[PDB]
Symmetry: none
Subunit: 73 residues, 5 copies
Protein backbone atom coordinates (compact mmCIF):
# COMPACT_ATOMS: atom_id res chain seq x y z
CA UNK A 1 0.00 0.00 0.00
CA UNK A 2 2.10 2.90 -1.26
CA UNK A 3 0.96 6.48 -1.75
CA UNK A 4 3.40 8.97 -3.19
CA UNK A 5 2.66 12.60 -3.87
CA UNK A 6 5.10 14.99 -5.45
CA UNK A 7 4.64 18.67 -6.01
CA UNK A 8 7.24 20.77 -7.83
CA UNK A 9 6.81 24.50 -8.29
CA UNK A 10 -7.56 39.99 -7.66
CA UNK A 11 -9.46 37.43 -5.58
CA UNK A 12 -8.36 33.80 -5.37
CA UNK A 13 -9.72 31.15 -3.05
CA UNK A 14 -11.95 33.59 -1.18
CA UNK A 15 -14.73 32.13 0.96
CA UNK A 16 -17.85 33.75 2.44
CA UNK A 17 -20.15 31.59 4.59
CA UNK A 18 -23.09 32.57 6.76
CA UNK A 19 -25.05 29.92 8.65
CA UNK A 20 -27.99 30.14 11.04
CA UNK A 21 -29.38 26.95 12.57
CA UNK A 22 -31.82 26.75 15.48
CA UNK A 23 -30.62 23.19 16.14
CA UNK A 24 -27.86 20.89 14.90
CA UNK A 25 -26.80 17.29 15.30
CA UNK A 26 -23.83 16.27 13.15
CA UNK A 27 -22.26 12.81 13.24
CA UNK A 28 -19.10 13.27 11.11
CA UNK A 29 -17.47 9.94 10.47
CA UNK A 30 -18.98 7.18 12.53
CA UNK A 31 -18.51 3.46 12.72
CA UNK A 32 -21.09 1.67 14.86
CA UNK A 33 -21.19 -2.02 15.56
CA UNK A 34 -23.71 -3.89 17.63
CA UNK A 35 -23.20 -7.62 18.02
CA UNK A 36 -20.90 -7.88 14.99
CA UNK A 37 -17.95 -10.16 14.75
CA UNK A 38 -15.86 -8.14 12.27
CA UNK A 39 -15.99 -4.56 11.06
CA UNK A 40 -13.11 -3.15 9.10
CA UNK A 41 -13.38 0.53 8.14
CA UNK A 42 -11.04 2.84 6.31
CA UNK A 43 -11.92 6.47 5.79
CA UNK A 44 -9.37 8.36 3.76
CA UNK A 45 -9.15 11.81 2.34
CA UNK A 46 -11.16 14.73 3.47
CA UNK A 47 -14.60 14.52 4.85
CA UNK A 48 -16.40 17.68 5.72
CA UNK A 49 -19.67 17.20 7.53
CA UNK A 50 -21.78 20.09 8.62
CA UNK A 51 -25.27 21.42 8.81
CA UNK A 52 -23.52 23.70 6.34
CA UNK A 53 -20.46 22.16 4.77
CA UNK A 54 -18.16 23.90 2.35
CA UNK A 55 -15.01 22.51 0.81
CA UNK A 56 -13.01 24.75 -1.44
CA UNK A 57 -9.87 23.83 -3.30
CA UNK A 58 -9.61 20.65 -1.25
CA UNK A 59 -6.62 19.36 -3.09
CA UNK A 60 -4.38 21.72 -4.93
CA UNK A 61 -1.19 19.96 -5.72
CA UNK A 62 -0.71 16.28 -5.33
CA UNK A 63 -3.10 14.18 -3.33
CA UNK A 64 -2.60 10.46 -3.14
CA UNK A 65 -4.69 8.23 -1.01
CA UNK A 66 -3.97 4.54 -1.06
CA UNK A 67 -6.03 2.13 0.95
CA UNK A 68 -6.09 -1.60 1.48
CA UNK A 69 -8.97 -2.61 3.70
CA UNK A 70 -9.08 -6.35 3.98
CA UNK A 71 -9.17 -9.39 6.17
CA UNK A 72 -7.51 -12.61 5.11
CA UNK A 73 -8.63 -15.86 6.69
Amino acid sequence: VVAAAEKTKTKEGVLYVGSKTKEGVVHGVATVAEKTKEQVTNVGGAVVTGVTAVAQKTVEGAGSIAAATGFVK
Copy 2:
Protein backbone atom coordinates in the same frame (compact mmCIF):
# COMPACT_ATOMS: atom_id res chain seq x y z
CA VAL B 1 -2.34 -0.71 -4.01
CA VAL B 2 -0.28 2.23 -5.25
CA ALA B 3 -1.48 5.80 -5.70
CA ALA B 4 0.92 8.34 -7.12
CA ALA B 5 0.13 11.96 -7.77
CA GLU B 6 2.54 14.41 -9.33
CA LYS B 7 2.02 18.08 -9.85
CA THR B 8 4.58 20.24 -11.66
CA LYS B 9 4.09 23.97 -12.09
CA THR B 10 -10.48 39.24 -11.25
CA LYS B 11 -12.35 36.64 -9.19
CA GLU B 12 -11.20 33.02 -9.02
CA GLY B 13 -12.50 30.33 -6.72
CA VAL B 14 -14.77 32.72 -4.83
CA LEU B 15 -17.52 31.20 -2.69
CA TYR B 16 -20.65 32.76 -1.18
CA VAL B 17 -22.91 30.55 0.96
CA GLY B 18 -25.86 31.46 3.15
CA SER B 19 -27.78 28.77 5.02
CA LYS B 20 -30.71 28.92 7.42
CA THR B 21 -32.05 25.70 8.92
CA LYS B 22 -34.48 25.44 11.84
CA GLU B 23 -33.22 21.89 12.46
CA GLY B 24 -30.44 19.64 11.19
CA VAL B 25 -29.32 16.06 11.55
CA VAL B 26 -26.35 15.09 9.38
CA HIS B 27 -24.73 11.66 9.43
CA GLY B 28 -21.58 12.18 7.29
CA VAL B 29 -19.90 8.89 6.62
CA ALA B 30 -21.37 6.08 8.66
CA THR B 31 -20.84 2.37 8.81
CA VAL B 32 -23.39 0.53 10.94
CA ALA B 33 -23.44 -3.18 11.61
CA GLU B 34 -25.93 -5.10 13.67
CA LYS B 35 -25.37 -8.83 14.02
CA THR B 36 -23.06 -9.02 10.99
CA LYS B 37 -20.09 -11.25 10.71
CA GLU B 38 -18.04 -9.19 8.24
CA GLN B 39 -18.22 -5.60 7.06
CA VAL B 40 -15.36 -4.12 5.12
CA THR B 41 -15.69 -0.45 4.19
CA ASN B 42 -13.39 1.92 2.37
CA VAL B 43 -14.32 5.54 1.89
CA GLY B 44 -11.81 7.48 -0.13
CA GLY B 45 -11.64 10.95 -1.53
CA ALA B 46 -13.69 13.83 -0.36
CA VAL B 47 -17.12 13.56 1.04
CA VAL B 48 -18.96 16.68 1.94
CA THR B 49 -22.22 16.14 3.76
CA GLY B 50 -24.37 18.99 4.89
CA VAL B 51 -27.87 20.27 5.09
CA THR B 52 -26.17 22.60 2.65
CA ALA B 53 -23.09 21.12 1.05
CA VAL B 54 -20.82 22.91 -1.37
CA ALA B 55 -17.66 21.58 -2.93
CA GLN B 56 -15.70 23.87 -5.17
CA LYS B 57 -12.56 23.02 -7.04
CA THR B 58 -12.24 19.82 -5.02
CA VAL B 59 -9.24 18.58 -6.88
CA GLU B 60 -7.04 21.00 -8.71
CA GLY B 61 -3.82 19.29 -9.53
CA ALA B 62 -3.30 15.61 -9.18
CA GLY B 63 -5.64 13.46 -7.18
CA SER B 64 -5.09 9.74 -7.03
CA ILE B 65 -7.15 7.47 -4.92
CA ALA B 66 -6.38 3.79 -5.01
CA ALA B 67 -8.39 1.33 -3.02
CA ALA B 68 -8.40 -2.41 -2.52
CA THR B 69 -11.25 -3.48 -0.30
CA GLY B 70 -11.31 -7.22 -0.05
CA PHE B 71 -11.35 -10.29 2.10
CA VAL B 72 -9.65 -13.47 1.01
CA LYS B 73 -10.72 -16.75 2.56
Copy 3:
Protein backbone atom coordinates in the same frame (compact mmCIF):
# COMPACT_ATOMS: atom_id res chain seq x y z
CA VAL C 1 -4.73 -1.51 -8.07
CA VAL C 2 -2.70 1.45 -9.30
CA ALA C 3 -3.92 5.02 -9.73
CA ALA C 4 -1.54 7.58 -11.14
CA ALA C 5 -2.36 11.20 -11.77
CA GLU C 6 0.03 13.67 -13.32
CA LYS C 7 -0.51 17.34 -13.83
CA THR C 8 2.03 19.52 -15.63
CA LYS C 9 1.52 23.25 -16.04
CA THR C 10 -13.16 38.42 -15.08
CA LYS C 11 -15.00 35.80 -13.03
CA GLU C 12 -13.82 32.19 -12.88
CA GLY C 13 -15.11 29.48 -10.59
CA VAL C 14 -17.38 31.84 -8.68
CA LEU C 15 -20.11 30.30 -6.53
CA TYR C 16 -23.25 31.83 -5.01
CA VAL C 17 -25.49 29.59 -2.88
CA GLY C 18 -28.44 30.48 -0.67
CA SER C 19 -30.33 27.76 1.19
CA LYS C 20 -33.26 27.88 3.60
CA THR C 21 -34.57 24.65 5.09
CA LYS C 22 -36.99 24.36 8.02
CA GLU C 23 -35.71 20.81 8.62
CA GLY C 24 -32.91 18.59 7.32
CA VAL C 25 -31.77 15.00 7.66
CA VAL C 26 -28.80 14.07 5.48
CA HIS C 27 -27.16 10.65 5.51
CA GLY C 28 -24.02 11.20 3.36
CA VAL C 29 -22.33 7.92 2.66
CA ALA C 30 -23.77 5.09 4.70
CA THR C 31 -23.22 1.38 4.82
CA VAL C 32 -25.74 -0.48 6.95
CA ALA C 33 -25.77 -4.19 7.60
CA GLU C 34 -28.24 -6.14 9.66
CA LYS C 35 -27.65 -9.87 9.99
CA THR C 36 -25.36 -10.03 6.95
CA LYS C 37 -22.37 -12.24 6.65
CA GLU C 38 -20.34 -10.15 4.18
CA GLN C 39 -20.55 -6.56 3.03
CA VAL C 40 -17.71 -5.05 1.08
CA THR C 41 -18.06 -1.37 0.17
CA ASN C 42 -15.78 1.02 -1.64
CA VAL C 43 -16.74 4.64 -2.10
CA GLY C 44 -14.24 6.60 -4.12
CA GLY C 45 -14.11 10.08 -5.50
CA ALA C 46 -16.17 12.93 -4.31
CA VAL C 47 -19.59 12.64 -2.91
CA VAL C 48 -21.45 15.75 -1.97
CA THR C 49 -24.70 15.17 -0.15
CA GLY C 50 -26.86 18.00 1.00
CA VAL C 51 -30.37 19.26 1.22
CA THR C 52 -28.69 21.61 -1.22
CA ALA C 53 -25.61 20.16 -2.84
CA VAL C 54 -23.36 21.98 -5.25
CA ALA C 55 -20.20 20.67 -6.83
CA GLN C 56 -18.26 22.99 -9.06
CA LYS C 57 -15.11 22.17 -10.94
CA THR C 58 -14.77 18.96 -8.95
CA VAL C 59 -11.76 17.75 -10.82
CA GLU C 60 -9.59 20.19 -12.64
CA GLY C 61 -6.37 18.50 -13.49
CA ALA C 62 -5.81 14.84 -13.15
CA GLY C 63 -8.14 12.66 -11.16
CA SER C 64 -7.57 8.94 -11.03
CA ILE C 65 -9.60 6.64 -8.93
CA ALA C 66 -8.81 2.97 -9.04
CA ALA C 67 -10.80 0.48 -7.05
CA ALA C 68 -10.78 -3.26 -6.57
CA THR C 69 -13.62 -4.36 -4.34
CA GLY C 70 -13.65 -8.10 -4.12
CA PHE C 71 -13.67 -11.17 -1.98
CA VAL C 72 -11.95 -14.34 -3.09
CA LYS C 73 -12.99 -17.63 -1.55
Copy 4:
Protein backbone atom coordinates in the same frame (compact mmCIF):
# COMPACT_ATOMS: atom_id res chain seq x y z
CA VAL D 1 -7.02 -2.19 -12.19
CA VAL D 2 -5.04 0.81 -13.40
CA ALA D 3 -6.31 4.37 -13.79
CA ALA D 4 -3.97 6.97 -15.19
CA ALA D 5 -4.85 10.59 -15.77
CA GLU D 6 -2.50 13.10 -17.31
CA LYS D 7 -3.09 16.78 -17.78
CA THR D 8 -0.59 19.01 -19.57
CA LYS D 9 -1.16 22.73 -19.94
CA THR D 10 -16.04 37.69 -18.77
CA LYS D 11 -17.83 35.02 -16.74
CA GLU D 12 -16.60 31.43 -16.63
CA GLY D 13 -17.84 28.68 -14.36
CA VAL D 14 -20.14 30.99 -12.41
CA LEU D 15 -22.84 29.38 -10.27
CA TYR D 16 -26.00 30.85 -8.73
CA VAL D 17 -28.19 28.57 -6.60
CA GLY D 18 -31.14 29.39 -4.38
CA SER D 19 -32.99 26.63 -2.53
CA LYS D 20 -35.91 26.68 -0.11
CA THR D 21 -37.17 23.41 1.36
CA LYS D 22 -39.57 23.06 4.29
CA GLU D 23 -38.24 19.52 4.85
CA GLY D 24 -35.42 17.36 3.52
CA VAL D 25 -34.23 13.79 3.82
CA VAL D 26 -31.25 12.92 1.61
CA HIS D 27 -29.56 9.52 1.60
CA GLY D 28 -26.44 10.14 -0.56
CA VAL D 29 -24.70 6.89 -1.30
CA ALA D 30 -26.10 4.02 0.72
CA THR D 31 -25.49 0.31 0.80
CA VAL D 32 -27.98 -1.61 2.92
CA ALA D 33 -27.95 -5.32 3.54
CA GLU D 34 -30.39 -7.32 5.58
CA LYS D 35 -29.75 -11.05 5.88
CA THR D 36 -27.47 -11.14 2.82
CA LYS D 37 -24.45 -13.32 2.49
CA GLU D 38 -22.46 -11.17 0.04
CA GLN D 39 -22.72 -7.57 -1.08
CA VAL D 40 -19.91 -6.01 -3.03
CA THR D 41 -20.32 -2.32 -3.90
CA ASN D 42 -18.08 0.12 -5.69
CA VAL D 43 -19.09 3.73 -6.11
CA GLY D 44 -16.63 5.75 -8.12
CA GLY D 45 -16.55 9.24 -9.46
CA ALA D 46 -18.64 12.05 -8.24
CA VAL D 47 -22.06 11.70 -6.82
CA VAL D 48 -23.96 14.77 -5.85
CA THR D 49 -27.19 14.13 -4.03
CA GLY D 50 -29.38 16.92 -2.84
CA VAL D 51 -32.91 18.13 -2.59
CA THR D 52 -31.27 20.52 -5.01
CA ALA D 53 -28.18 19.13 -6.65
CA VAL D 54 -25.97 21.01 -9.06
CA ALA D 55 -22.79 19.76 -10.67
CA GLN D 56 -20.89 22.13 -12.88
CA LYS D 57 -17.75 21.36 -14.79
CA THR D 58 -17.35 18.15 -12.82
CA VAL D 59 -14.34 17.00 -14.72
CA GLU D 60 -12.20 19.48 -16.53
CA GLY D 61 -8.96 17.85 -17.40
CA ALA D 62 -8.36 14.19 -17.11
CA GLY D 63 -10.64 11.96 -15.13
CA SER D 64 -10.02 8.25 -15.04
CA ILE D 65 -12.01 5.90 -12.94
CA ALA D 66 -11.16 2.24 -13.10
CA ALA D 67 -13.11 -0.29 -11.12
CA ALA D 68 -13.04 -4.04 -10.69
CA THR D 69 -15.86 -5.20 -8.46
CA GLY D 70 -15.83 -8.94 -8.27
CA PHE D 71 -15.80 -12.04 -6.16
CA VAL D 72 -14.04 -15.17 -7.31
CA LYS D 73 -15.03 -18.49 -5.80
Copy 5:
Protein backbone atom coordinates in the same frame (compact mmCIF):
# COMPACT_ATOMS: atom_id res chain seq x y z
CA VAL E 1 2.51 0.93 4.00
CA VAL E 2 4.62 3.82 2.74
CA ALA E 3 3.48 7.41 2.22
CA ALA E 4 5.93 9.89 0.79
CA ALA E 5 5.20 13.51 0.09
CA GLU E 6 7.66 15.90 -1.49
CA LYS E 7 7.20 19.57 -2.06
CA THR E 8 9.81 21.66 -3.88
CA LYS E 9 9.39 25.39 -4.37
CA THR E 10 -4.95 40.90 -3.85
CA LYS E 11 -6.87 38.36 -1.77
CA GLU E 12 -5.78 34.73 -1.54
CA GLY E 13 -7.15 32.09 0.79
CA VAL E 14 -9.39 34.54 2.64
CA LEU E 15 -12.17 33.09 4.78
CA TYR E 16 -15.30 34.72 6.24
CA VAL E 17 -17.60 32.58 8.39
CA GLY E 18 -20.55 33.57 10.55
CA SER E 19 -22.52 30.93 12.44
CA LYS E 20 -25.47 31.16 14.82
CA THR E 21 -26.87 27.98 16.36
CA LYS E 22 -29.32 27.80 19.26
CA GLU E 23 -28.13 24.24 19.94
CA GLY E 24 -25.37 21.93 18.72
CA VAL E 25 -24.32 18.33 19.13
CA VAL E 26 -21.35 17.29 17.00
CA HIS E 27 -19.78 13.84 17.11
CA GLY E 28 -16.61 14.28 14.98
CA VAL E 29 -14.98 10.95 14.36
CA ALA E 30 -16.51 8.19 16.44
CA THR E 31 -16.04 4.47 16.64
CA VAL E 32 -18.63 2.70 18.77
CA ALA E 33 -18.74 -0.99 19.49
CA GLU E 34 -21.27 -2.84 21.56
CA LYS E 35 -20.77 -6.58 21.97
CA THR E 36 -18.46 -6.84 18.95
CA LYS E 37 -15.51 -9.13 18.73
CA GLU E 38 -13.41 -7.13 16.24
CA GLN E 39 -13.53 -3.56 15.02
CA VAL E 40 -10.64 -2.15 13.07
CA THR E 41 -10.90 1.52 12.09
CA ASN E 42 -8.55 3.82 10.26
CA VAL E 43 -9.42 7.45 9.73
CA GLY E 44 -6.86 9.32 7.69
CA GLY E 45 -6.63 12.77 6.26
CA ALA E 46 -8.64 15.69 7.37
CA VAL E 47 -12.08 15.50 8.74
CA VAL E 48 -13.88 18.67 9.59
CA THR E 49 -17.16 18.20 11.39
CA GLY E 50 -19.27 21.10 12.47
CA VAL E 51 -22.76 22.44 12.63
CA THR E 52 -21.00 24.70 10.16
CA ALA E 53 -17.93 23.15 8.61
CA VAL E 54 -15.62 24.87 6.18
CA ALA E 55 -12.47 23.47 4.66
CA GLN E 56 -10.46 25.70 2.41
CA LYS E 57 -7.31 24.77 0.57
CA THR E 58 -7.06 21.60 2.63
CA VAL E 59 -4.06 20.29 0.81
CA GLU E 60 -1.82 22.64 -1.03
CA GLY E 61 1.38 20.87 -1.81
CA ALA E 62 1.84 17.20 -1.40
CA GLY E 63 -0.55 15.11 0.61
CA SER E 64 -0.06 11.38 0.81
CA ILE E 65 -2.17 9.17 2.94
CA ALA E 66 -1.46 5.48 2.91
CA ALA E 67 -3.52 3.08 4.92
CA ALA E 68 -3.59 -0.65 5.46
CA THR E 69 -6.48 -1.65 7.68
CA GLY E 70 -6.59 -5.38 7.98
CA PHE E 71 -6.70 -8.42 10.17
CA VAL E 72 -5.04 -11.65 9.14
CA LYS E 73 -6.17 -14.88 10.73
